[PDB]
Each structure stands twice: as C-alpha cells, then as structure tokens.
A paper describes a structure:
The nuclear pore complex (NPC), one of the largest protein complexes in eukaryotes, serves as a physical gate to regulate nucleocytoplasmic transport. Three scaffold rings, including an inner ring (IR), a cytoplasmic ring (CR) and a nuclear ring (NR), anchored onto the nuclear envelope (NE), provide bases for other functional parts, such as the cytoplasmic filament, nuclear basket, and permeability barrier. In both CR and NR, named the outer rings, the backbones in each subunit are formed by one or two Y-shaped complexes, also known as the Nup84 complex in fungi or the Nup107-160 complex in vertebrates. Here, we determined the 8 Å resolution cryo-electron microscopic (cryo-EM) structure of the outer rings containing nuclear ring (NR) and cytoplasmic ring (CR) from the [name] NPC, with local resolutions reaching 4.9 Å.
In addition to two copies of Y complexes, each asymmetric subunit in CR contains five copies of [name], two copies of the Nup214 complex, two copies of Nup205 and one copy of newly identified Nup93, while that in NR contains one copy of Nup205, one copy of ELYS and one copy of Nup93. For CR, the highest resolution reached 8 Å for the core region of the CR subunit with a local resolution reaching 7.2 Å, while for the whole CR subunit and CR [name] region, the resolution reached 8.7 Å and 8.9 Å, respectively. Strikingly, a total of 5 copies of [name] NTD could be well modeled into this region, suggesting that there should be at least 5 [name] proteins stably bound to the stem region of Y complexes in each CR subunit. Overall, the top [name] seems to act as a lid to cover the remaining [name] proteins, and the latter form direct and extensive interactions with inner and outer Y complexes to stabilize the stem region. Then, we fitted this rake-shaped structure into the flanking density above the short arms of two Y complexes and found that there should be two copies of Nup214 complexes in each CR subunit. It seems that the two Nup214 complexes help to stabilize the two short arm regions of Y complexes in the CR subunit and contribute to the head-to-tail fashion of adjacent CR subunits. For the question-mark-shaped density attached to the Y complex arms in CR, similar to the NR subunit, according to the isotropic density map of CR subunit and AlphaFold2 predictions, we modeled and fitted two full-length Nup205 structures into the question mark shaped densities, which are attached to both the inner and outer Y complexes, named the inner and outer Nup205. For outer Nup205, its NTD connects to inner Nup43 and outer Nup160, the tower helix region binds to outer Nup85, outer Seh1 and outer Nup160, and the CTD interacts with Nup107 of the adjacent CR subunit. This result showed that inner and outer Nup205 help to stabilize the formation of two Y complexes in a head-to-tail fashion in CR.
Residue numbers in the entry:
A (entry chain K): 1 to 375
B (entry chain T): 1464 to 1554
C (entry chain L): 9 to 333
D (entry chain H): 746 to 802
E (entry chain T): 1190 to 1280
F (entry chain J): 1 to 653
The structure:
C-alpha cells in the first residue's frame, strides 16, 4: 500500500498473471505484466504496471499499487497463455475461442488480431472444445483439455492442423514439453502418460506411476531451455524431476511440502530460480534447476541437491557414494527450501518472479509485489 | 599443562602433524617424526596412540616401513645418497 | 530446363537453413530446410539475362543477400523481401533486385562478403586478373556503393581468400591466385595486406615456389590468431600451414614475415584438380577436378590424409553404395 | 527503553537528509539520470520521514 | 600488515574477460613483479577494448578515461605497497 | 567407404549406368553433403519436391539411439562429478574413489546391456546387430574391469588371484548357462554335465552351492557318499586369503601344499579313485591342458583359461610371471583349435602392461573417445606418470574432449555437455566454442535462448552481441519493431536503432504517428543511442508542461532543444513552429533580457535552419505557408517582447 512491499486489493479473481517481456530482456527493468479476468463478468486481458522501489529506468513512484496501463476485450473466455513472442499473445478459452492479440511496443496498446470462433478444427469448421493449459514453443502451440483433448497450432501460420479428441480417464490439468514428437501429461491422482505426435484411437500408450507416495498432481511446467526438464507441484509433493526423457517408470521421488502447491514458476531471464507458492501463505525460492551444478542455497526437503567442488582430503581412505536403482529414493535434486514467509497470508493462488521482482495473486482477491533481496 | 592443552585442542593438530609427517619430504618428515617420538615419550594416558591406531593409520605406517626398507636398499646399493639419510634412519 | 544442362554453382548456408542452385537454365532455385525435417522447393526465378555462373550468401550479421554472377558482364544483388509477414504469418518472398555490381567487361569468377567493423566490403573479381572492392557509404539503404579498392595482378582470377579480423593490430588481408590452364608461369599466389599507415592495400607475400594454375584456395580462419591452413587445388593435393613469426614495430600492414611450407602433399588425381572442400579445421577433404574423379581424405589423430573414397564420374558406374552417409 | 529510543531518534535526526544529486550543464541523458536520482531520493526521503516520525512518536 | 602487490585488477565487465586480460598482461619490467608501464598498460587496455566492439561506440570515451585513471591510481598504490614489502623484506 | 573406394552414383544397370555422375561436395554447418553434378556424360536431375535419389548425407548415424544418449549423458555427468572431486589430496582416498566410480561405470554398463537386450527381444530383424553391440559392450566392460583391477591397484601376489577369480565369476555366464542346461534335464544329478558344472563352480570359487550340489549327488547316487565326503573334506583346505596380521603368502603356500598333499594321499589310498567321474574331476583339478582344451565347453576364452591355470597349478603368482603365464595361456589356447582376435590381442597387451602402449592400441583400434578419456582420467587419479603429448601435439584429454564435442555437435540436439567440456580446456576450447556457437543456427527462439544462456553462463560479450544482432535482424525481417529495438538496446548497437528511427520518421511523414509512451513508461540508453525516441519524449514532456501551464519551463525546454538540435529538417520545422502558443500570451511576468535572448536564439536557429536546408534557398513543398507562419510568429514575438518591456517597466514602480 504505502509502506514495505506493495499490497493492492484489486477485488477480482487472479487467474493467469504473467509478466510480459516488453520491459524484460532489455535495458529497461521489468514492471509491466498482464492479467486475465477469468471467473468474472467479462473475460478481459488487462495489461498493468507495478510500482517498484528506486528508479533505475523511469519506474513508477508512490510506494506500490499497480495501475492498469491498458486492457483488451473479446467475446471469448480466458484460461491461460504462454509468451511465445513479445508482441504475440495466444489465449485459449473453455468455449472454443482462441484469441491471438497483437501488442504494440511502440504504442503500449493492445489490438484484436485474430479471434478463432471456429478453433480446434482440422476436418471442417464450427468446433467448440474446452481448454485447460496452453503452452507454446518453437514452432508449435499445444493446448490440452480435461478429457485428453489435444490441439496443435503452428507458429508460422494462423490455422489449426491437429485436433485429437479421444476418451481418457481421470482429469488432466497442465502440460509440459519434451521434444517435437513426445508429450508428457500428468493426472489428478499421480499418473504420467506419454503420447506421441501420431496417436490414433483410444487407450493411452505408456502410463507410469511412482511407488510409495502418490498424491494428486496439480501444477506442472517445463523449462524454457531444455524441454525435458519438468517442474511439478501438487498436493503433498510428488514431482519427477529428470534431466532427460527416457526410461519407463520415473525413478525420481521428491516428496515435501504437505500444503497444496497451486503454481510453480521459473525465472524467465536466468532459468535457474524456481518460485513455489503454498496454500497457507508461503513463498519458497529454489536455486539451480537440476542441470545447473552450483552450491545449493540451503538444504530443506527430501532431495539429493547438487554436487560442487571438493578438496582437502585426509591421507586415509574416504568414499564417493555408490550406485543404486529404486523408485523410492530421489535421484535429481531441485527443492532448496528458503525460509521467507512461514505464515503471513491466509491463502495464495499464483506467483510469478522476474529479474528481481515477485508478484503474487492470492485467493482473497489481492496482489502483492515484493522486491527480492537474496540470490 | 601441555598435555591438557593438547587434549583440549583434540585431533586437529594431531591430524595436521600426521599429514605433515606422512606426506612430507626428508628434513621435515624427520623433524615431525622426532616430535612424535618426543610427545609419545612424554605421554601418560596413551589415548593419542589409541586414536592413532583407531584412525586407520596402520596402512600408512606399513607404507612408511616400506619406504624405510627402500631407503635401506638404496643405502646398501653402491653410491649412497646424502648424509641426512643416516640421521633420518636413526630417528 | 530443370537442372539438365550444365551445372554451374550449388551453395549451402552456414547455419543449415537455405540452399541455392544455379545452372544453364537461365534461372536460380532457392530451397529452404523444413523445421520438421527434409527440404523442398521454396522459390525459383530469373536473376540474369544469360547463364548465371556463381552465387554466394552474405555474412550472418546482415541477412541472406544473394550475389548472382553471370556471363553478362554484370552481377545482380537480390534480397528476400517479405510481404504480409505480421504476427504468426510469413509473407510471400518477393525477389527484388536492390542494386548491381558492374564496372568490368569480363565475367565474374567469385564473390564474397565482409563482416561489420567498417561496413560491407563487397569483392568482385573479373576474368582478367582484376578485383574490385566496393564499400557501402550508408547503412539504411542497400542500393548504393563506392569503388574503394582496385587490385590488378597477373594472368586471370579464380578465387579469393580473406581473414575475419577480431584481434588487435590485425587487418583482413586478401589472397589472390592466378590461373591460365598452363603450369609454366612462375609464381601464382599473392597476398596483399591493408596497410593502415597509408589506408591502402600493399604487397606482402608472393609464393614463387608454386607454378601450377590455382583454381581455388580454401582458407582456414582462426580469428586472426594462432596459425592458418591453406589448401590449394592445382594438379595434386597440396595443403600448407602458415605460421606467424614476428611483427615489426615500424610497418603497420606493409611487409610481413610469414613462413609457408608444404605440410600435406598427396598425389592421386593425376590430372587437374579444380575444387576442394573444407570442413571445421581440416578434417575431411574432398577434391574434384575436370576429369571425372573425386578423392576423399580424412584426418585422424595425426596429420596425414589417407585415401578413403575414389568416386568415378567419367566412365561407367559399377555399383551404388554410400549415397547418404 | 527511553534511552534506547532517544539514541535512535538522535542518530536519525543527526543523519543528514539526502540530496537530489545533480550538477550544472546537463544533457538529455544527464537530465534522465538526474530525474532517476531525484525519484530515488524522494523515495528514500519518504521512507526516512516515516521512520523518523515513528521513532519520534 | 602484508602488502600484496597486484598488477591489474578489473571489475566493470565479465570476470572471464577480466581474468583473460590479467593473464595476457603478465610480463616482467623494472619494478621486479609482473606489472607493466603506467602508459603501456593503459594502451594495452585501450587496444583490447577497441578490438572487441561492433559499430556503436558513443559516450564510452569518458568512462574509459575514468577507468584508466582509477587503474592508474590502483597501480600507484600497489607500487607503493610493493616498495613497503621490499623494505619489510630487507628488514 | 572409410578406407577403400566409394562406388559411383546410380545403379549398375545399363539404362541408368550409361550416364555417369560426377558427384560434387557441399559444406554448411559442419555436415558435408553430396550433390548430383554431371560431367563428361549426361545426367537425370530435376527440380521438384524433396531430394533426388534420397541424398541425405550424415555421419555418425549409428550412434543415435534413445538409450545410448541417456547412458552417455549419465556417464559424462559422473565424469564431471569425478573431475570436481579430483581437487582432493592423494592417498588411499583417491584409490577408493576410483574403485567407486569404476563400480558405478560397470553398473551403468550392465544397465545399458540389459536395455539393449530388451530392445533386441522387442525387435526382430536387427537382433544380430543388437547382439553384436551387446557383446561389444560386454568386452568393453571386461577390459574396463581388468584395467581397474590390474593398473590401479597393482597388488602383488595373494589377493590378485582372488580378484581375478571374482572378476571372472562376475563377467562370465557360461557356468550359469551350463547349470541351466543341466536343470533342463529330467535328472540333474544323473546328468553327465553335472560334474562339469560342479568343476566350473569350484573354478569360479563359489563353494557353498558347490558343496550343496556335492551333498545332493551323494544322497542321490548310492556309490558316491564317501566319495563326496572325502571331496568336501579336501575342499575345506582351500585358502580364502588368510589375514593373520597382514598380507602373508606363507600361509597361502602352506594351505596349497597341504591341499595338494591331501589330494595325492587320497588318490594313492583309493578313496578318490575307482570312479570315472571323480577321476576325471581330479585329473582336471591337478592342472592339465589337453583335458581343458577338450572340455572347453565349460571355460570361456583365453582369460578363463589363464585364471583356470593359475588356480589349478600355482597358489599365487607374481606380476613378473603373470604376463608370461597369460602369454602361454593364449598360445596354447590358439594352438588348441582357435583363431587370433583383436580383442584378445588387446587383452594380452593389457596383461603385458605398459599403459602408454595399451592406450595407444586402444586409440588405434577403438574409436570411442570417451573410453580413452575415462582411462586417462583414471590413470591421472592413480598418480602415475602420464604422457603430456598426443604423439603429435599436447594433452590427450583435451583432444579427446574436442573429438567428443565435435561428434556431439554433429547431431541436431543436446549440446549442454560440450559447454562444460570446453570450459575444462583453457586453451583451444574457447575458440572452438566461439566458432561452433556462431556456426550453429540461431533462428528458432528455443535454441536462441539456449545459446544466450550458455554464453551468459560463460560470461562473454561478442557472442551475446552476435546473437542479439541475429535475433534483431530476424525480428526486422518478421516485422517486429519493438523486439528489434529491444535486441538493439541489449546489444548496445545503433544500426537497428537508427533503422527503426528512420522507419518512425517516414511513418510520421506519411500519416503522423507519435503516440509512443514507451519512453515515458521506461527509459535507458536508447534515448542516447538514437534521436527519434528522444524527440518523442521531449514532445510529450512539452505537451504535458503546456497543459500544466509553465511558460518559463516552456522557454527553458525550447532553448535546450534548440541547443541540442534533434531530428532532421522535417521535425526541425515543427520544433521552430512550436513557439506561437508561448508567444501569443500576455500574462505571467516576463523579463526583458530573457525575451531578448530568447528571440535572438530563435532568430539564430531559424537562420541556421535556412542555411542547412539549402544554400540561400528553401526546398520541400511548404513555401508560402512556411513564410506566412514565419511572419505571424515574428508578429507574435514582437507583441510578446513589447508586453515583456511593459511588464519590466511596470515592475520597477
């Protein structure tokens, strides 16, 4: 509000809030973001700007309270979106209305480019299929639904050329990446399904689970660089972090945080800092996204962490671990618990970190903006 | 007082002296071995020797004995080395 | 026709994205590699009134500028101009001739580009031993140039070699090689250095040992540091290693003290080699000539070159193997 | 507690106020830098005034 | 206190390039260490920052001059520390 | 192919062979390609879809496998871990870490062999190739374990035979195959191969199940109870490496002598005779050659023959005679119906030692650079004298890492290990990475960000600027002005910045686009690199200040703009025109000297503008309108200076 970190009461559902690369990946500091207005009266994408401390690139004044720089309107709904380009933003809907908007950097405004009223088409037109998670990469944008419905769009043309509508069990919420011909989907119980680019008929291809602890998986995200790196956060913690994309059943088991994790975000600039939110009002910051071998920032959690340089050994006889294969002990480290906020907020929905600023939308219709001080 | 200070220090200086004596050269190794001999002579509780035997230094002592045997073979062979080897073997 | 007459020049992109083909069909064909796999015909159009001879791309610090050479005593410059390429849409590639390079009365043998640093040093060699270097006076327009350098050597021209400068107190030199289908002229390779004290090119080295016609010279760039490798395709297989000795404190680009000796001599063509390949730093060498014979050599953990493939192209084929590996 | 609060308030009021950090003959980039410095100085001055009011109370 | 003399130490660019420049600027002179001449080191730094550019270079000359002046003050202080260390070694 | 002569193109049929093809070469991103060029004879080339005669030249195609790349990644990860841990001191800890990493390597190799066996069982046609690859991997693991137990430990007599027997029983499955073949029969105890399996188990060393099978045979056959009892009583004298204080060979020799004496006494008494099976067992255990050559179905190869000889002939052997015994074993094995083999010769060389020559033979025969790199790393960890030259240059590990990096970059995916493998080399690795990351394409956003993060972790600047310029020109070709400007201000370049500035200039000249609040939202160095963004910001500030009413600040900003001189003539005209709204007013205190200097600066600026437009003339199409605007501006300025003089005269009252 007027002291310490920024706290605003926008009084609206904080669905999908993501920082745009307009003020990022440049000399300017990140401060401009976008928010979808899902579960409201009118699903509108609003571009806002926060107020950070100091002034390194003509930042906002006061002590906080973000302000809406612009807003766009569309008859479709708002689910989520993945920043494929700085000026292109593709948002899906649960009623089959894909909105591709054109953001002008030289104008700081939004223009309605494409509104696919007949999206998810491949053998005709006028098709309505709900969507749950839409993620983009080079050169395909993949959207998943609830009953296993998959939709694929190209980045070089404005058309849909792949719509697979099968009959799957349970419910799938989220989608990660692997390569140009593999898709890994998580279930709401603890199952992992591996599908190919050319799959016909019912019956999933490969289904795997984790022995021991099986909690409902919730949020799942992919690494912006290596696609085979997956960060998952569910109920009591059950992610299968792996630096590859082979093997049958996942040999990794990282069980921590009994509270339900609703979203786990990555650092877009330097993909080596993960930020995880808790349902009891907690924000954990993990370092070294598995592949990055560096000294860990404090332990915490049932994980193997990473190894660094070792020197100064006694003239006796030491050891250097061993080799074992089991589906119970962890294999890849990732969780680095950092005590930041034990219990301050009654509920927390989503969070997003960029450069040195973290936005956090809570379930009580509020937003918090905090400038990081650690590393 | 010296023994009490050594016991209060613990195994840090002991391990340092052991490393300097094992992974040494000639004069330094001989001086460290003489210091160990003197501290063993002035010892009274044998806990230092017990710790040396429990820390697994038996293989290192065997290697030191093998090095001493190699030095003795080199001395028995013609053309002996420096005169410091005699004092090293004496210590 | 459709690549059925006399093949002229085929070229590939250093990034593995585009390829260009030209022949006696009075037109060139530019193909693009698909993002999912394989390639297909992307575009095909007329670049010159006569038979297009050579075609070379530009440095990755500019774009995909096509320098189409032909026997019409001219040289066309083309750029893939897009149309409605907005958002997730790619416009139609409209081939528009921006400018042209013409100042001689003979055909062009080779053409290459230059990095940033100063601008765009465009080189054009004629069929009589005369090369010309043009500079772009502006950066917001590619329809103008000024002839800044002219080098007239002996005999005719063939290929040119440069040096990507990146270090200190180093200037990109120019290596020229004369040829006339007659191994009777003493000295065929020359090297000119851009002396900065006069801001002009000056003589540096002249290989008086080689007397055979030089059809092309493959240079191994090393960022202007360490050593250099020069592969010459005369009558046999010749590869030399140029090692820097010392630099004087008086000449800022005049006379140089370089040593060049034979480090890889291999005779197997027994004819006239016309072209030689170039890989990373000299690993796989494919030599071809005007006799229907291709010789392949590989460099293992030593420094020699063993014969690993003798492809025929003048007689009759005996089999079909190793066509895609 | 009173002596601790008095020492805190005394050091707070002895700490001199910040300066806008600007000089003469400024270009456009220098003007932008001076504006950023003035903004950060205003933020620091507001924070210091709040802290001083709290300590004084 | 110990007076450790450092030849060149930079902290405005990447640490990899800083270490590369430090390793490149290593040669004997007249003081006795691996330091260079007060003007020759600045000339070498100017040549190094000039040979690694692109096309745009405006507003960098005053910053380079300030960096050169700071490096000159640093090497002057390090030469004073070197004289102090030499006097201490003589004592 | 790779040593002989390649075959020409087309089929050897007359129709397609009447015209030969002079295949030409082409280069690109390091992957050489072959194109169909015609010479002398004619050709049949076309220009349509795909490539003619499926010309897809690519090397190292057999290494591309889903499990192979995963195993290589795991091996290189544990290799990086070993190099990170190698900074410790020397002693027994280094040998323990070496044994641990060797066990981990053998475990991951066994896992790879199991995965290859599963793939072979899944496939059908490639079963022979998969079995060949499995045998090659097994031979590699055998050589690795032999090198680890021979060169690293270098133990003399005593535990060497036990370690060799353990390695043999761990890497040999022929005894298990014989046991399975015996169990396949309806009567395993009455089978003729049961005694062979028992002798094989005794040779391997597992005495528990051997004695169990002997007791079972004694309980089954009625004429073998006392025989098996005597055999079990004799086998109890086997020496299982006694430790009576230290490693002593006297106890081993005494136990072997007692065992031999007991066997001879039993054979002379008769309790170990009068039975064909046990007689043949004793004749084999005594230590012969022709009997083992006949029963070669039990043993494996030359190493199995050598360990059998060393177990059934001597108590223990010394390293001075181990090579002689291995050579004699290989000799008589080749004499007894066999043929030479490259892997057999490599194993013989490894037994004959000389690490330099064995790694030379390895590099000559096998092309696996990772194996030689691991061997050199183990030899360096063992604190041994190694060669500092690659028999031509210097440092073999750097050359091996460069070869592996080239082989990995030959692929189209996974280029993360090459970064650390080049960072490990503080010599040619820097330039190699700088040449490879600039030669690989940087078009797609995924690999663009990958290379950006790689060069950022490497802490470079030239590569960053090159990637930024490449993505900026890509955005310019795709019509992304904002992205191009962001990339330009990231690379600190001004070419694309001035290009976008001229684009904005022509857009304003065409339609008049000036609503650009990006500079007011965020700033930096773009306003210093260019002039269009600075002009837009100054115009917005002037508009806001005129809306908030401040004639003093208006005059100050006008003087600042006139002294700075921004934008060309098309906007200099508007900058000079922007003065009438500040001149028609009559209120607000105005100073006489201030008005005088303001009008002087305005007249000097208009004179400079007229001189810079053209020598003593004007251009464009706005001539009479410009003259009328100048006249009305001069009239307004005269009125304003008159009002200022009036105010100055009235203030001093």
């Amino acid at each position: 509000m007027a002291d310490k970190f920024a706290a605003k009461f926008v009084s609206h559902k904080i669905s999908r809030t993501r920082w745009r690369p307009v003020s990022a990946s440049s000399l300017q500091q990140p401060d401009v973001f976008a928010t979808g207005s899902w579960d409201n009266e009118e699903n509108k994408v609003c571009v806002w700007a926060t107020s950070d401390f100091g002034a390194t690139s003509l930042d906002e004044e006061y002590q906080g309270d973000p302000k809406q720089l612009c807003d766009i309107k569309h008859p479709g709904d708002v689910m989520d979106m993945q920043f494929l380009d700085k000026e292109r933003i593709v948002t899906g809907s649960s009623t089959g209305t894909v909105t591709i908007f054109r953001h002008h950097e030289n104008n700081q405004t939004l223009s309605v480019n494409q509104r696919w009223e007949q999206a998810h088409y491949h053998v005709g037109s006028n098709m309505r299929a709900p969507c749950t998670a839409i993620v983009c990469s080079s050169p395909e944008i993949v959207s998943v639904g609830e009953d296993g419905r998959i939709n694929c769009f190209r980045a070089e043309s404005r058309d849909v050329l792949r719509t697979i509508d099968d009959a799957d069990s349970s419910t799938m919420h989220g989608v990660t990446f692997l390569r140009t011909t593999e898709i890994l989907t998580v279930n709401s119980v603890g199952q992992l399904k591996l599908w190919d680019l050319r799959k016909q008929g019912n019956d999933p291809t490969q289904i795997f689970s984790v022995t021991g602890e099986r909690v409902p998986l919730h949020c799942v995200d992919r690494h912006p660089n290596q696609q085979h790196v997956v960060a998952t956060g569910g109920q009591d913690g059950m992610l299968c972090i792996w630096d590859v994309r082979h093997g049958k059943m996942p040999m990794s088991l990282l069980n921590a945080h009994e509270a339900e994790m609703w979203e786990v975000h990555f650092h877009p600039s330097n993909p080596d800092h993960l930020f995880t939110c808790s349902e009891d009002g907690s924000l954990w910051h993990w370092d070294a996204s598995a592949d990055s071998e560096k000294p860990t920032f404090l332990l915490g959690g049932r994980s193997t962490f990473n190894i660094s340089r070792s020197s100064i050994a006694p003239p006796n006889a030491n050891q250097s671990l061993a080799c074992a294969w089991l589906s119970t002990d962890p294999t890849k480290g990732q969780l680095e618990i950092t005590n930041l906020l034990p219990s301050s907020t009654l509920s927390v929905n989503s969070l997003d970190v960029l450069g040195q600023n973290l936005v956090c939308g809570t379930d009580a219709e509020a937003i918090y903006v905090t400038r990081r001080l650690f590393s | 007082d010296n023994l009490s200070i050594f016991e209060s220090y613990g195994t840090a200086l002991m391990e340092v002296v052991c490393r300097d004596a094992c992974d040494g050269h000639d004069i330094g190794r001989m001086l460290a071995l003489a210091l160990l001999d003197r501290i063993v002579s002035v010892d009274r509780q044998q806990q230092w020797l017990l710790y040396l035997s429990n820390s697994g230094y038996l293989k290192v002592l065997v290697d030191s004995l093998a090095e001493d045997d190699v030095v003795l073979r080199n001395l028995l062979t013609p053309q002996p080395p420096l005169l410091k080897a005699l004092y090293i073997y004496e210590s | 026709a459709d690549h059925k007459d006399l093949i002229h020049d085929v070229s590939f992109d250093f990034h593995g994205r585009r390829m260009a083909t030209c022949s006696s069909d009075q037109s060139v064909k530019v193909w693009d590699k698909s993002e999912n796999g394989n390639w297909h015909c992307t575009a095909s159009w007329k670049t010159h009134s006569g038979s297009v001879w050579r075609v070379t791309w530009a440095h990755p610090e500019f774009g995909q500028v096509l320098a189409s050479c032909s026997f019409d005593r001219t040289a066309a410059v083309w750029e893939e101009i897009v149309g409605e390429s907005n958002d997730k849409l790619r416009g139609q590639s409209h081939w528009v001739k921006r400018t042209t390079l013409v100042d001689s009365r003979t055909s062009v043998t080779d053409v290459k580009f230059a990095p940033k640093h100063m601008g765009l040093m465009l080189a054009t060699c004629s069929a009589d031993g005369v090369v010309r270097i043009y500079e772009a006076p502006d950066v917001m327009n590619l329809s103008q140039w000024s002839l800044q350098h002219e080098i007239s050597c002996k005999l005719s021209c063939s290929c040119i070699s440069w040096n990507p400068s990146s270090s200190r107190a180093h200037s990109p030199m120019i290596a020229v090689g004369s040829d006339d289908s007659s191994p009777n002229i003493m000295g065929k390779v020359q090297i000119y250095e851009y002396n900065e004290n006069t801001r002009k090119y000056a003589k540096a080295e002249t290989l008086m040992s080689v007397s055979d016609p030089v059809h092309d010279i493959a240079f191994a760039p090393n960022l202007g540091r360490s050593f250099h490798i020069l592969a010459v395709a005369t009558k046999d297989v010749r590869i030399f290693t140029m090692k820097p000795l010392r630099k004087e404190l008086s000449s800022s680009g005049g006379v140089t003290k370089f040593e060049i000796h034979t480090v890889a001599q291999f005779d197997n063509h027994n004819s006239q080699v016309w072209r030689v390949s170039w890989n990373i730093t000299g690993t796989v060498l494919a030599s071809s000539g005007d006799d229907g014979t291709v010789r392949l050599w590989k460099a293992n953990y030593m420094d020699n070159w063993k014969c690993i493939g003798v492809l025929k192209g003048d007689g009759n084929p005996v089999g079909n193997s190793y066509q895609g590996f | 507690e009173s002596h601790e609060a008095f020492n805190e308030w005394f050091k707070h009021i002895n700490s001199p106020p910040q300066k806008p950090t600007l000089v003469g003959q400024a270009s456009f980039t220098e003007k932008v830098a001076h504006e950023h410095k003035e903004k950060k100085y205003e933020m620091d001055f507001g924070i210091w005034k709040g802290h001083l009011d709290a300590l004084t109370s | 206190s110990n007076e450790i003399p450092e030849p060149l130490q930079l902290d405005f660019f990447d640490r990899s390039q800083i270490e590369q420049v430090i390793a490149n600027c290593e040669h004997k002179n007249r003081r006795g260490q691996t330091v260079c001449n007060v003007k020759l080191l600045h000339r070498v730094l100017v040549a190094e920052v000039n040979a690694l550019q692109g096309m745009a270079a405006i507003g960098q000359r005053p910053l380079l001059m300030e960096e050169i002046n700071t490096i000159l003050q640093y090497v002057v202080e390090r030469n004073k520390l070197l004289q102090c260390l030499h006097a201490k070694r003589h004592a | 192919m790779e040593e002989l002569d390649v075959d020409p193109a087309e089929t050897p049929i007359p129709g397609l062979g009447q015209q030969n093809r002079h295949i030409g070469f082409s280069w690109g991103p390091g992957d050489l390609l072959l194109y169909e060029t015609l010479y002398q004879k004619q050709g049949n080339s076309e220009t349509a879809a795909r490539c003619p005669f499926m010309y897809l030249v690519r090397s190292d195609e057999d290494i591309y496998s889903p499990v192979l790349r995963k195993l290589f990644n795991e091996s290189h990860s544990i290799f990086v871990g070993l190099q990170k841990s190698a900074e410790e001191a020397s002693g027994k800890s280094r040998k323990a870490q070496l044994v641990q990493v060797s066990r981990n390597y053998r475990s991951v190799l066994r896992a790879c062999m199991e995965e290859m066996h599963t793939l072979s069982e899944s496939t059908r046609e490639t079963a022979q190739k998969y079995i060949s690859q499995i045998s090659i991997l097994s031979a590699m693991e055998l050589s690795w374990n032999l090198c680890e137990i021979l060169f690293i430990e270098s133990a003399p007599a005593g535990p060497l035979l036990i370690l060799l027997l353990e390695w043999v029983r761990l890497h040999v499955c022929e005894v298990d195959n014989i046991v399975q073949d015996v169990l396949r029969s309806e009567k395993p105890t009455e089978h003729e191969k049961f005694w062979d399996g028992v002798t094989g188990y005794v040779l391997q060393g597992r005495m528990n199940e051997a004695r169990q099978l002997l007791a079972k045979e004694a309980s089954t056959s009625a004429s073998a109870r006392s025989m098996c009892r005597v055999l079990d009583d004799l086998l109890k004298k086997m020496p299982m490496l006694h430790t009576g204080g230290t490693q002593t060979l006297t106890e081993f020799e005494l136990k072997w002598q007692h065992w031999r004496e007991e066997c001879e006494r039993h054979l002379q008494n008769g309790t170990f005779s009068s039975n064909v099976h046990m007689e043949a067992v004793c004749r084999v255990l005594l230590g012969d050659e022709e009997v083992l050559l006949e029963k070669r179905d039990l043993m494996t190869t030359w190493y199995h023959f050598l360990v059998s000889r060393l177990l059934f002939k001597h108590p223990t052997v010394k390293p001075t005679e181990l090579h002689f015994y291995a050579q004699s074993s290989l000799d008589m094995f080749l004499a007894g119906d066999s043929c030479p083999e490259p892997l057999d010769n490599i194993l013989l060389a490894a037994f004959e030692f000389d690490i330099h020559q064995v790694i030379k033979e390895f590099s000559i025969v096998s092309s696996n650079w990772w194996f030689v790199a691991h061997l050199t790393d183990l030899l360096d960890h063992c604190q041994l004298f190694q060669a500092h030259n690659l028999y031509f240059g210097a440092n073999m590990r750097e050359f091996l890492l460069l070869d592996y990096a080239s082989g990995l970059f030959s692929h189209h995916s996974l280029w993360q290990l090459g970064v650390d493998y080049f960072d490990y080399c503080p010599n040619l690795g820097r330039e190699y990475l700088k040449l490879h990351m600039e030669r690989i394409p940087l078009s797609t956003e995924k690999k663009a960000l990958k290379a950006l993060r790689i060069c950022e972790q490497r802490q470079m600047t030239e590569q960053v600027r090159s990637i930024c310029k490449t993505m900026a020109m890509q955005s310019l070709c795709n019509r992304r002005l904002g992205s191009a400007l962001s990339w330009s201000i990231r690379a600190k370049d001004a070419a694309f910045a001035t290009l976008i500035s001229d684009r904005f200039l022509k857009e304003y000249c065409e339609r008049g686009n000036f609503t650009d609040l990006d500079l007011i939202d965020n700033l930096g160095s773009a306003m210093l690199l260019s002039d269009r963004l600075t002009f837009l910001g100054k115009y917005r500030e002037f508009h806001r200040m005129y809306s908030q009413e401040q004639f003093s600040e208006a005059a100050s900003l006008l003087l600042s703009l006139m002294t700075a001189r921004i934008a060309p003539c098309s906007f200099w005209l508007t900058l000079l025109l922007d003065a009438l709204p500040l001149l028609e007013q009559k209120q607000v205190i105005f100073s006489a000297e201030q008005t005088y200097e303001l009008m002087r600066c305005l007249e000097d600026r208009m004179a400079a503008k007229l001189e810079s437009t053209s020598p003593d003339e004007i251009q464009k199409q706005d001539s009479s309108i410009d003259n009328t605007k100048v006249e009305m501006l001069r009239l307004a300025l005269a009125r304003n200076l008159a009002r200022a003089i009036v105010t100055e005269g009235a203030l001093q009252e």
